[model samples]
Target: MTILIIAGILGFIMAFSIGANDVANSMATAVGARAITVRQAALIAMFLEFLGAVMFGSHVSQTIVKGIVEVEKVQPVELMYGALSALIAASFWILIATNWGYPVSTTHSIVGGMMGFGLVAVGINGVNWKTFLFIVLSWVVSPVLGGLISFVMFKLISLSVFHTKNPKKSSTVAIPFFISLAIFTMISLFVKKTLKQPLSESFLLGIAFSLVTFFVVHFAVRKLINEKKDVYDAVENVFKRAQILTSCYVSFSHGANDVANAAGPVAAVMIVASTGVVPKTVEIPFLALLLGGIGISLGVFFLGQKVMETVGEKITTLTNSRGFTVDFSTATTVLLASSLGLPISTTHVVVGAVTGVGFARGLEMVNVGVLKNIVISWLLIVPTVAATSAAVYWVLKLILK
Candidate 1:
């Protein structure tokens, strides 16, 4: 009972920390481009995040609890302490990072926390080194893929539509193909991964969705494009309308994946308290997911703007088209990783996507100095949070034992 209570409170704190820091992951580009206000972003994130958590947030939680440490080998009491220590440590580090507006990875933070407890409780052998390395390598691969895809995607947009003899007329004509491309990727992600359908079925469903998206986007862009006088303005306006949907998609996807960081530990604690054995597929309690979703929304509502400004406005000058490119590219990469059942940091990919946009013009176009902080955060967060978890676990052992 005490364990469940402590875990629930700590889970809320962890979820809040994730929300405050990470809402910028999805909404920053849209806010930066002035396509949506921070308030609007928060509201959209709140609703969609809750929906995602309710629907598809359990797999990652199961992965975290069952795939990392050898819980089956430990005493239920000790496992409870380890999970509690991990949750508290991850929550503390994320809160600090959020206060700094750093937008660090909650996934990395929680993984570090778990590894810390695993090392102290059962030694290095107890930790699943294979899973650890896969997730770590995924962090590196995710960002690189985000940058490459965005670079190619934007360059194609520029060559196909933006640089044409009549950009306005060409945009109305050629952009359906571009829209279809992004939609195909998005639909494939949703069908294959989110819906958990067969790959063949996913491809067929994706084709259907892409056709619908292409026509809808085509008609909308055509209608909106004629409103602006300058061709550049027309293009930006059209993409602004498009960027809103991408922003919501990013938020929904983020919520689906990230709710696990908090709820995983909470679910682990609950299982330890009740069953005394870590099953291969422990069901995450519904209340745990619900509160995690609520905490995330609250944090985004109150504390997401500072990082939003940093991501959207300070990383580079953003117009609607560029921001849409960044959002679509980043979301697509994250979705691909998710579909492959791989864990990737959304913040890292977001940074990579922005860098891709910078490369569309040239590398020198971006503010390189601000990027140094992300490097520092990625390097420090894991070791630092691990050490913190160890200290907390040591203290908990002294008191609880």
Candidate 2:
């Protein structure tokens, strides 16, 4: 019982810290493009995040709650002590990283936590080194993949859409781009919760979303050609609307997926400490997941703007077109990353992309020094968490043993 309570607390703390750092992961650009204000983003983020965490979040690694450590190998008392120590260590390590405004991986933290306690509970064999290696690999891969996809998309946009000399030709080419974006727009909105809806319901929602997109594109093209709305502002406004919608999409996905990263191990602690039996599947306690989600939303509501300011406006000049490009690029990268089960960081991808565009434009727009610092923090997050957990595990073993 004591272990369960402490683990739950730590779980929420991790969730909160994750929100504090990563809320800007995608939502910032929406606001930067003037599609939504900070408050609107907060409200949309909170609602969708809560819904995703509770209803249809990812459980691809549900077994992770119990699989990382040799819980069965350790004595019951040792298991309890180990879990508590892991929770304590992970919570503070993550909090430290967030205070410095670094986007650390919660996935990495708990894995490190598991290894830390496992080493003390039994030995090196107590840890699953194979899974551990992949978890470490994700830290590097997530950021690089983010940068690459963003780079490729930006290059494509520059070559295809922005460089066109003739307006009619550009408008004609954009027809397919318009259709493709509409599809992803619906996908972005519904994918997080679509599975919960019946097939009939989902189909109807899909049609509605598609219709909205078709009409908006039609209006945008008409406005540009016939009414003579400022071409730059017209493109900007459409991108603005799209960026807002996509930001909400990413927020919902985050709520669904990330809540697990915080709550998975803690839930394992609950099952182990209470029953003296470990389950093969790390069943997510919906209530615990919900709590983590809400904690995340609260952090986003209050401190989200700060993270937003750092990345959305301060990091680069986010016009509607560029913001749309970034958001679309992020969605593509994350969705592909998800499909391939690569476990990438959506924030890293978006920021890396921003830096890519920043450098493309010139030195003044991209702050290499600040970018260097942020990159350094990303490098440190996993290793520091692992080291912290290791120290905490030994201390707890000494005190609790």
Q: What's the TM-score of each model vs. the native?
A: 0.90, 0.79
> Model 1, poorest ten-residue lDDT window?
359-368
Candidate closest to the true structure, highest lDDT: 1
- Model 1, 263: alpha-carbon shift in Å? 1.8
- Alpha-carbon local distance difference test for all models: 0.79, 0.63
Q: Cα lDDT of model 1 overall?
A: 0.79
Highest TM-score model number? 1
lDDT per residue (tens digit) for residues 1-401 in model 2: 66666776777777776677777776887776557777787788888777656644445235355556765677766666666666667678767766666566665665667677777667887776676566557656765666676667666756665677754435434643645464644454354343555656666666666667766766665554444366555545555565676676567656655666666665666666666666554456666677678778887777665666555565345665566656666655555444333445666667666765544344454478766866676666656666677787787667765
TM-score of 2: 0.79
For residue 327, give model 1's deviation from the true position in Å. Answer: 0.7
Query: For residues 178-269, what per-residue lDDT tens digits would candidate 1 score against the true structure?
Result: 56766677667666766789999989988998889878878877898899999898887788777887787777667777888888888888
**Residue 45 lDDT (model 1):** 87
